[PDB]
């Protein structure tokens, strides 16, 4: 069975809302405010940063390749030979992962830390494995 | 463009959370507490009642038929001839719609009103078309 909480964040303008399931090992940690603040902060980060996936593995190979091809064609359209265009696309893909993947995004409260490192920091402090299971972000009109 | 708000409800035990996009015609109504209370109440209803769809049209024909066949086979397994089993299944399907469809569920704050009628009541009072666009319900461990 899963332990943890459903963290959330509702923007003051009530135009953006997020729910996030943050899992841990025990109800004791789940009830703890340190863990509760982490779920709350993750929910706020998601609302502000709009990631589409929790992790890189969730991106469809077709979605990834299409984006990569856009990068490639653009460079090719710049007169860049295939080999260069591929390296350029390589870099833009890394950026693309930071645009859409939660764990790869710099944390809203400290952009010097990626969300995945924030999580490792929490596991080290708290002492239990912590996992962001899923999240849902609704934005008015989008 | 869409007007309205993202309503929400987080259970006190933080084990269930819901976001609901409630749409209206103007920002003036969207900012209004009557509309805001309706979005809030819909979000609470969803959290407590666990509907899977907003409306009946969203149910997969395969999901519906499978459920209907369970009803039918059960009655057939009771020695009920096909014609009777079909009428029994007909009734259980109506109930099935009330189990999983939001608009067909009796409102948590007044079970004498289906959520769809609550909405018609709000449109009559408020004076603008109101639509539940979508909702997301997260439950810890489920």
UniProtKB/Swiss-Prot annotation, chains A, B:
Annotated region described as Involved in Mg(2+) ion dislocation from EF-Tu, given as residue ranges: 26-29
Subcellular location: Cytoplasm
Key words, A-Z: Cytoplasm, Elongation factor, Protein biosynthesis
Gene Ontology CC, one term: cytoplasm
Family of this protein: Belongs to the EF-Ts family.
Assembly and interaction partners: Heterotetramer composed of two EF-Ts.EF-Tu dimer complexes.
Function: Associates with the EF-Tu.GDP complex and induces the exchange of GDP to GTP. It remains bound to the aminoacyl-tRNA.EF-Tu.GTP complex up to the GTP hydrolysis stage on the ribosome.
UniProt-recorded name of the protein: Elongation factor Ts
Residues of the whole record sequence present: 55 to 196 of 196
